[PDB]
Amino acid sequence: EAPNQALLRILKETEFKKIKVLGSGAFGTVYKGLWIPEGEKVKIPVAIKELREATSPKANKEILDEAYVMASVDNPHVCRLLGICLTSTVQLIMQLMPFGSLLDYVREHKDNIGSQYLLNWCVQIAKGMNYLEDRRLVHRDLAARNVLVKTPQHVKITDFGLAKLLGAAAAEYHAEGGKVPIKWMALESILHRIYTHQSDVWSYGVTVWELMTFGSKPYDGIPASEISSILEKGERLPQPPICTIDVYMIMVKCWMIDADSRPKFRELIIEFSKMARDPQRYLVIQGDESNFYRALMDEEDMDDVVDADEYLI
Ligand SMILES: CCC(=O)Nc1cccc(-c2c(-c3ccc(N4CCN(C)CC4)cc3)[nH]c3ncnc(OCC(C)C)c23)c1
């Protein structure tokens, strides 16, 4: 296949500042901060994923695998890797998404989210996924928790810790046994651990169902072991109250057991774009329709602030 000529930039620890902790887990802490590359009069808002311990060999391999696939994508609707820092504890430096996950955002503003935003988000995520399909990359963990909000008008796919690049001439990826989110997975992934771009389309439909229900948990109260028999019986997630049948039909088509009968991300872009032209016809919602970076980054001087989307090499 085509050679992968993505650049991997190694960053000095002294040219980025950590401002605050966005979140923490066993994997490690995600900081929010500024990256000031020397010689350039720019300041990039960044999220900095530090690894908890320096000594874990499996965790260090996994964070570099994440950097490999993240550096291999360059799309407006995919979160971009700025670089890595090879300190005692490895650090990923990513474009800052100020508003957090789309899942947390819709739960936070159920009352203030209109159909224009929901349909635009669906378009943007389909565009990101279709770009990932052109790159022959399977995400394997598409969910509302892994879509971040740069602005309310602009969302990006992230969390490539499970993503796999398809080798030359292959269209399926066979995975070894591991922790995996069953309620977002195509049937063929649950049973045979096969993953394709059409398996991601299944996860796309669940993601859209998450958005359309304003943050509800799919199959709440149902064990993941039973999910396989439920799917084989022909049951699916129910129509969200705001959804016209036009929208719900697209979600249902994403959950066909025959993977080739599901839509392609190319077609999802087209269909949700049509609906984004007249949003209130396809979603029925009650009551429908410079200094910010200083406050965010807590730094008085923001004259040279530049979003990574305007920073290229
Ligand atoms: C994967 C789920 C998740 O929440 N991940 C996460 C954890 C901590 C920070 C961020 C994050 C955030 C972020 C997450 C949460 C918030 N808050 C804002 C305040 N609000 C009350 C709650 C949500 C603000 C920013 N922005 C990012 N940008 C680029 N990469 C990131 O990390 C990406 C992961 C893949 C390294 C992140 C995301």
CATH of the domain at 276: 1.10.510.10
User: Which residue minimizes the CA distance to atom 34 of ligand 1?
Assistant: 159
For residue 29, the CA-to-ligand 1 centroid distance in Å is 10
Question: Based on the domain organization, do 149 and 242 belong to the same domain?
Answer: yes
Question: Based on the domain organization, do 60 and 159 belong to the same domain?
Answer: no
Domain enclosing residue 87, as ranges: 1-96
Question: Based on the domain organization, do 2 and 126 belong to the same domain?
Answer: no
Q: What is the CATH number of the domain that holds 33?
A: 3.30.200.20
Asked if residues 73 and 65 have their Cβ atoms less than 8 Å apart, the reply is no
* Residue of 19, 30, 70, 151 with the most ligand 1 atoms within 8 Å of its CB, for mutation: 30
Task: Give a yes or no: residue 161 inside a domain.
Answer: yes
Dig out the tokens for 229 from the structure.
Answer: 């028999």
Q: How was this structure determined?
A: X-ray
For residue 32, the CA-to-ligand 1 centroid distance in Å is 9
Question: Based on the domain organization, do 78 and 154 belong to the same domain?
Answer: no
Atom of ligand 1 nearest to the CA of 79: 29
Distance CA 52, CA 59 (A): 9
Question: Based on the domain organization, do 79 and 211 belong to the same domain?
Answer: no
Task: Give a yes or no: residue 306 inside a domain.
Answer: no
CA torsion through residues 158, 29, 182, 214, sign: negative
Candidate list 65, 104, 141, 258, residue with the active-site label:
141
> Does 30 contact ligand 1 (Cβ within 6 A)?
yes
Question: Based on the domain organization, do 262 and 213 belong to the same domain?
Answer: yes
* Nearest of 13, 1, 215, 9 to residue 106 by alpha carbon: 215
Dig out the tokens for 214 from the structure.
Answer: 């304003």
For residue 24, the CA-to-ligand 1 centroid distance in Å is 10
Task: Give a yes or no: residue 221 inside a domain.
Answer: yes
* Residue of 97, 109, 145, 147 with the most ligand 1 atoms within 8 Å of its CB, for mutation: 97
* Nearest of 16, 75, 98, 6 to residue 50 by alpha carbon: 16
Task: Give a yes or no: residue 310 inside a domain.
Answer: no
Please report the resolution in angstroms. 2.6
Task: Tell me which long-range contacts 163-167 makes (C-beta under 8 A, separation of at least 24).
Answer: 163/69, 163/132, 163/137, 163/138, 163/139, 164/137, 164/138, 164/140, 164/195, 165/69, 165/72, 165/135, 165/136, 165/137, 165/138, 166/136, 166/137, 166/138, 167/1
Helices 115-134 and 265-277 sit at what angle, rounded to 10 degrees?
A: 160
Atom of ligand 1 nearest to the CA of 96: 28
> Does 80 contact ligand 1 (Cβ within 6 A)?
no
> Does 147 contact ligand 1 (Cβ within 6 A)?
no
Atom of ligand 1 nearest to the CA of 49: 36
Question: Based on the domain organization, do 274 and 190 belong to the same domain?
Answer: yes
Task: Give a yes or no: residue 313 inside a domain.
Answer: no
> Does 96 contact ligand 1 (Cβ within 6 A)?
yes
Distance CA 280, CA 4 (A): 43
Residue 141 catalytic? yes
Exposure class string for 163-177: b at 16+ Cβ within 10 A, else e: bbbbeeeeeebeeee
Residue partners of 301: CB distance under 8 A and separation at least 6? none
Question: Based on the domain organization, do 160 and 292 belong to the same domain?
Answer: yes
Categorise residue 226: left if φ over 0, alpha if ψ from -120 to 50, beta otherwise: alpha
Question: Based on the domain organization, do 84 and 111 belong to the same domain?
Answer: no
> Does 115 contact ligand 1 (Cβ within 6 A)?
no
For residue 93, the CA-to-ligand 1 centroid distance in Å is 13
The CA distances from residue 28 to 52, 54, 127, 172, in Å, are: 4, 10, 30, 31
For residue 55, the CA-to-ligand 1 centroid distance in Å is 25
